[PDB]
From a paper:
The cytoplasmic-facing Lipid II is flipped to the periplasmic side of the membrane by a Lipid II flippase, after which the GlcNAc-MurNAc-pentapeptide moiety is incorporated into peptidoglycan and the lipid carrier is recycled. MurJ consists of 14 transmembrane helices (TMs), of which the first 12 are organized into two 6-TM bundles termed the N-lobe (TMs 1–6) and C-lobe (TMs 7–12). We determined four crystal structures of MurJTA: one structure in an outward-facing conformation to 1.8 Å resolution, and three structures in inward-facing conformations distinct from the published structure, resolved to 3.2, 3.0, and 2.6 Å, respectively.
One of the inward-facing structures exhibited a partially dilated membrane portal but was otherwise divergent from the rest of the inward-facing structures. Specifically, the C-lobe is bent with the cytoplasmic section swung ~15° towards the N-lobe. Conserved residues Pro260, Pro300, and Gly340 serve as hinges on TMs 8, 9, and 10, respectively. Furthermore, a reliable in vitro lipid II flipping assay for MurJ is still not available despite attempts by us and others. Since such close contact between two arginine side chains would experience unfavorable repulsion, we reasoned that they could be stabilized by electrostatic interactions with Asp25 and the diphosphate moiety of Lipid II.
Author numbering: 2 to 468
Write the structure that this text describes.
Amino acid sequence: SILFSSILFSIATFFSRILGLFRDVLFAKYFGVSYELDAYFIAIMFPFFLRKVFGEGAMSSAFVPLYSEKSGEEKDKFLSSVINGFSLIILALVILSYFFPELIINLFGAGSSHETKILAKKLLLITSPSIYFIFLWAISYSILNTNNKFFWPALTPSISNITIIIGTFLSTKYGIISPTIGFLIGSILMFFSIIKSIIKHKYYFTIKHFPHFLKLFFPTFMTMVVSQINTVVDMNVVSFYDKGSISYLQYASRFYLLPYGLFAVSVSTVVLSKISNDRKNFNYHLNDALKTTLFFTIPSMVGLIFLSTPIIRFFYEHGAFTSKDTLITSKILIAYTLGLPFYGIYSTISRSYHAIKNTKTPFIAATIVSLSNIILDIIFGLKYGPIGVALATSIAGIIGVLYLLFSVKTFPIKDFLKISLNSLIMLFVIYLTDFTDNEFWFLIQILIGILVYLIFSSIFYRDLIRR
Ligand code: NA
């Protein structure tokens, strides 16, 4: 029982990590880089952006306290208010979307070609309704958060991936609309997966509590918008360059995002819970988290940059994804990957501040990062295209972390220097091993790099290991 629960949950988490990668592999094989996939991304970008905002707690942060302070029927009324109000908004937001699709389109792919915008308009007819099920999924999620802190809903998004993957398999019959339908159905099934939390409540035909809830919800919602806006800006900027730019950024983003989610984000969740449970030792916990992030993100970066082309070719260069796409996506991946350690630090510091209820400093950091990213998007995007946009993302990350480090005034410098030294030693060794051109050699280079890095980590952290 107890053992079963743990092993099943761990399997589900592992597969959750794998499914995004597999979906992008299938996109590469079945669509490659094309205006069609660009239009798909434009069509799914607004609902995806909203789900990303709500997953960071934009809904929970305002809903949970206002919901908990209420009692009896009023509680349900509050819930109903939230459901009704947003539904109304969403309804308007869908109706307008049907009549003025250019409004939605120009937010994410203003510069894309005519055929791309026509196809994206077509796909919005399928993706716009998913916003409704995404909002309801979010609300359900919050209600659960009163019952238990986090739990499985974190894995409910996996549902979406499965359906999209299924759609991709069927695309040989129908084309891009099959993955788009897959996206919509996935949204609906997410909502159904956690629907129990709302379906147990009585429905009231009211928006009694909605204005007050908006008064408390809008500030936090906008902070999260700013914190998540960089991807929208990057997408809309590169939309002005040749077709497939959006798709290139997505493909490179996958391999940026695996190590980021595994090394940075997880450390950040741990530190948030730790500091929230043990506030008075803020510094200690923060330092610990920082060290951990640096221990994994610096070598990863090095490795990923050195092996970016064989990695991209191994995972993507099949079917519709060509060697040209490999070249371009490799360069973009390098540009993104220069920023990995900085965004790791950034995430850790931001969530520590959140752990002590400081929203101002994280919001200022996010503002610096987004402003920097748009400025550098214009400049470097004009000079270098998509690669310039990715590089702008990395540099903006650096600036943000400089602000956060000066603000929090704590950092494990000694461990940073040790980790950097080990990473350069590792790089030297794998450079020596790069003497043969084989499509699978990079896997043994990964093993060699890991071994060297761990050897020198065990040398330089011998006292810690012993104790
Ligand atoms: Na950028």
